[PDB]
Ligand SMILES: Nc1nc2c([nH]c(=O)n2[C@H]2C[C@H](O)[C@@H](COP(=O)(O)OP(=O)(O)OP(=O)(O)O)O2)c(=O)[nH]1
């Protein structure tokens with residue numbers, strides 16, 4: 195089995211809109227996504243999620259709620275990406291374009307699935323329904339899913 199590297203993903207989800215960022219470079223460039231990145235040495239996963247939100251979007255939040263976990267495997271890459279997914283409804287500040295991301299709000303009847311990672315079509319609806327989830331997706335390149343597992347859980 196492969197080793198895994200810890201990542202976070204943060205979704206700012208208000209009652210009628212969600213904040214996403216257009217990834218301007220790096221992994222997932224050209225796709226709308228939540229905010230996140232690698233967890234660093236000695237920080238808790240939640241604190242790494244708060245840090246990444248602030249670094250990429252300029253937003254601070256006092257607390258985050260863990261909503262899911264997704265493991266990503268890419269053909270031809272030796273490590274798994276273990277993504278810990280968090281949500282908040284309560285933000286401080288206005289989003290700021292960073293080098294990584296251009297933030298934009300989307301109404302919840304206009305979730306830009308065609309411009310998001312393909313797996314998001316599977317798990318994002320669960321997030322909207324307040325259902326915690328564990329997932330795993332194997333990709334060949336950026337577009338093609340070869341295998342995946344998704345399950346609702348009571349405890350993330
Ligand atoms: N929505 C979604 N997010 C994903 C998928 N795969 C995946 O790694 N992510 C998230 C986890 C992280 O938020 C981000 C990947 O982290 P990153 O490469 O931006 O990390 P970083 O900020 O530390 O990278 P860098 O600035 O050092 O280049 O994408 C996916 O299929 N769907």
Ligand code: NA
Nearest residue numbers: 230231246250
């Ligand atoms: Na980052």
Ligand code: NA
Nearest residue numbers: 229230231294
């Ligand atoms: Na990032």
